Design a protein around this ligand. Structure first.
Ligand SMILES: [Zn+2]
Ligand SMILES: [Zn+2]
Lengths: 111, 37
């Protein structure tokens, strides 16, 4: 997650203080240079799971097309829950389901 | 004259296109509204 400039409102890029050997972040427009907290500079993923539980809203109980299940809420002992599978649509994705309580609104799973 | 348009305007029949059809759950016959023994 890359930040933005507190003065110029552009985005800061990494750089090296060769006289102190500490990773700064350099604005390519202005001269402002702030200290950073995290020495990470890059990331790359192939086994991702973003979109597992994200396909939920507060009013997901209001969808009248979702099938309703009898699973017990571990949290709230609710005998009425709507359910659905992983909203990620890749070919190799799992087929495990998700469970939303209409009473307690906690999402859960059967594991 | 009480005809079709009076039913439509009294809120007992409405029109749905294909897109709105995505969000609805249509019973096939009036008996399907209740589970039989
Ligand atoms: Zn800047
Ligand atoms: Zn609950």
């Amino acid at each position: 997650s890359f930040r933005f400039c507190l003065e110029c409102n552009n985005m800061l890029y990494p750089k090296e203080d060769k006289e102190n050997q500490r990773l700064l972040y350099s604005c390519r427009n202005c001269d402002y240079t702030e200290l950073a907290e995290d020495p990470k500079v890059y990331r790359h993923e192939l086994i991702t799971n973003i979109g597992e539980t994200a396909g939920i809203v507060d009013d997901i109980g209001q969808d009248p097309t979702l099938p309703r299940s009898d699973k017990e809420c571990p949290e709230c002992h609710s005998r009425d829950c709507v359910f659905f599978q992983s909203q990620q649509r890749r070919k190799d994705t799992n087929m495990t389901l998700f469970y939303v309580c209409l009473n307690c609104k906690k999402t859960f799973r059967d594991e | 004259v009480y005809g079709w348009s009076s039913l439509v305007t009294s809120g007992v029949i409405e029109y749905v296109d294909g897109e709105e059809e995505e969000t609805i759950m249509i019973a096939m016959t009036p008996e399907d509204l209740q589970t039989r023994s």
